[PDB]
């Protein structure tokens, strides 16, 4: 799961550590990594979460 | 440290990323230099300034300055080293451009100049080397001298033209 | 570089001046120039030429066509000489002059499966002072436990024979021109009548 998540993370120019820190920095994201994987199989929603996360480490 | 310079009248100095071109009476005497230093010149006179006083930084300044000094003064006036052979026999001669030593060995010992270096044998026991790249004239004179470096007892061999030498004793 | 093929015929006695010498007679018969291999069309420079004609009835069709590109009669052996670029066909006379050194390459005589005393000049072991490896046997074969190995490369009973062997600096004693014979000082390897090749010295020593 983790190995698949950082792939899309870096695909957008973030990475696993920064991306889950940004999905944690917003309190409201509490989904399991497996569901982040299924999102990594649906690029549009994954990018929506990437922009959400990255708007939380600013 | 050393810095003051004297560029003459019949030469010209380019500059490019530290590595300048030079011409004059004998051109194409380019030399490498480091980018970290300031290859520069006012006009009537040159300089190499050191940007920072670091130890390894400081060494390059004096290295590069003597190098530009020799490289430009050699195209401006030239270099010429003289030597003498000493010992019984020890002939030398010029075949075309090549120098035939005939010096204390079963065979004649020849040397073919690298380009830019000119041998001359003004006297049968007097070698002379003329050129610009002082580094190459030095390696050429050394290649001749090594053929019979002086012995510790009697001083047979190649010698710089004014040279003295120590003599061990023996029987 | 330059070379030709032929067949070892036999050995003999010979007198150059008064010094008796053993020569070996190769027959280096004419060789067709079959294939002119150039690096621009083959990656490397060489020439392939033939020896000992084969009755056309015995050729495959592909080989009749191989030769048929070159206008050449089928020959049971073809070979390639690196760096060699002759013209016409390779007669032996033109390639050699009397006294010049030539390497002589032929296939060693197959002695089959040979012991170690025969193959590698092994020692043997006493033939009476106790044993029952009376001769022949290689003795020990390794250390003990440390490297449990027996070395890769180790010398052992085996096929002593049939190797290609080159023999260096043989001397052309004589050249019979219209017979396509060529004398060579001393021995060359092979059973008689095997193929062999004569070439310029691999190392032209001074």
């Amino acid at each position: 799961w983790i190995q698949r998540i950082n792939a899309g993370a870096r695909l957008h120019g973030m990475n696993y550590s920064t991306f889950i820190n940004g999905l944690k920095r917003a309190n409201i994201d509490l989904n399991r990594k497996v569901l982040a994987d299924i999102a990594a199989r649906e690029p549009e929603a994954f990018k929506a979460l990437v922009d959400a996360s990255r708007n939380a480490r600013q | 440290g050393k810095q003051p310079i004297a560029v003459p009248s019949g030469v010209t100095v380019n500059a490019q990323d530290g590595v300048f071109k030079v011409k004059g009476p004998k051109g194409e005497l380019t030399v490498p230099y480091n980018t970290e230093l300031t290859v520069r010149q006012d006009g009537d006179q040159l300089l190499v300034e050191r940007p920072s006083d670091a130890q390894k930084h400081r060494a390059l300044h004096g290295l590069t300055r003597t190098l530009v000094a020799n490289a430009v003064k050699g195209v401006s006036d030239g270099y010429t080293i003289n030597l003498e052979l000493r010992g019984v026999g020890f002939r030398a001669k010029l075949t075309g451009k090549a120098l035939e030593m005939n010096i204390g060995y079963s065979h004649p010992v020849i040397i073919e100049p690298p380009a830019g270096v000119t041998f001359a044998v003004p006297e049968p026991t007097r070698i002379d080397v003329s050129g610009i790249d002082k580094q190459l004239v030095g390696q050429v004179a050394a290649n001749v001298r090594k053929v019979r470096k002086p012995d510790a007892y009697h001083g047979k061999g190649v010698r710089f033209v004014g040279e003295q030498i120590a003599l061990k004793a023996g029987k | 570089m330059k070379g030709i093929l032929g067949t070892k015929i036999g050995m003999t006695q010979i007198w150059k001046n008064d010094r008796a010498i053993p020569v070996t007679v190769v027959l280096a018969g004419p060789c067709p120039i079959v294939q002119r291999k150039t690096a621009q069309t083959d990656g490397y420079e060489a020439v392939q030429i033939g020896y000992a004609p084969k009755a056309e009835r015995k050729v495959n069709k592909p080989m009749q066509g191989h030769f048929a590109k070159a206008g050449v009669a089928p020959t049971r052996i073809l070979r390639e000489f690196r760096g060699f670029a002759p013209d016409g066909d390779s007669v032996n006379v033109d390639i050699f002059a009397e006294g010049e050194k030539i390497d002589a390459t032929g296939t060693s005589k197959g002695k089959g499966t040979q012991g170690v005393m025969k193959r590698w000049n092994f020692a043997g072991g006493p033939a009476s002072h106790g044993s029952k490896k009376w001769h022949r046997r290689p003795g020990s074969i390794g250390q003990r436990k440390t490297p449990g190995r027996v070395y890769k490369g180790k010398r052992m009973a085996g096929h002593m024979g049939m190797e290609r062997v080159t023999v260096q600096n043989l001397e052309v004693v004589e050249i019979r021109a219209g017979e396509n014979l060529i004398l060579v000082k001393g021995a060359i390897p092979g059973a008689n009548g095997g193929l062999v090749v004569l070439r310029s010295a691999a190392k032209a020593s001074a």
Binding site: A7, D37 | - | K152
Partner: protein
């Protein structure tokens, strides 16, 4: 439960090597081969891109390494010892140097052998694989 896909992809890329450190470039190629850049869809299958290095002979070794680095490789024979080719004279056949790096980091298993296939070193500025139409990819990572 977890999504897996078919190996339907086959992708070609031209990594450059000129001026790059060895090793730095080598890990990038090992990552692209082993598949980490795409959602590493399985351990089980090799979904990595095909990687066509060019100008490998302009590779940089950033230390004193061009000398004094060594290349031991054992021929089974005793005295076939550390048959040390070591240096820039291994840049007599430059391409294998780079291979040896990425294969140093590609897996040692059946699959790990089999992926080395897709490594296509080319010490010159030119490569044959125009029919594959490889896609450019930059030596800087981020």
């Amino acid at each position: 439960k977890t999504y897996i896909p078919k190996n339907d992809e086959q992708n070609w890329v031209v990594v450059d090597a000129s001026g790059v450190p060895l090793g730095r470039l080598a890990t990038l190629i090992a990552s692209r081969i082993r598949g980490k850049h795409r959602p590493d869809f399985t351990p089980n299958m090799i979904q990595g891109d095909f990687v066509v290095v060019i100008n490998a002979a302009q590779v940089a070794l950033t230390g004193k390494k061009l000398d004094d680095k060594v290349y031991t490789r054992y021929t089974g024979y005793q005295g076939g010892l550390k048959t040390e080719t070591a240096r820039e004279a291994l840049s007599k056949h430059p391409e294998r140097v780079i291979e040896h790096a990425v294969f140093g980091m590609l897996p040692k298993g059946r699959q790990g052998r089999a992926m080395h296939t897709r490594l296509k070193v080319y010490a010159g500025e030119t490569h044959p694989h125009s029919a594959q139409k490889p896609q450019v990819l930059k030596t800087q990572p981020l």
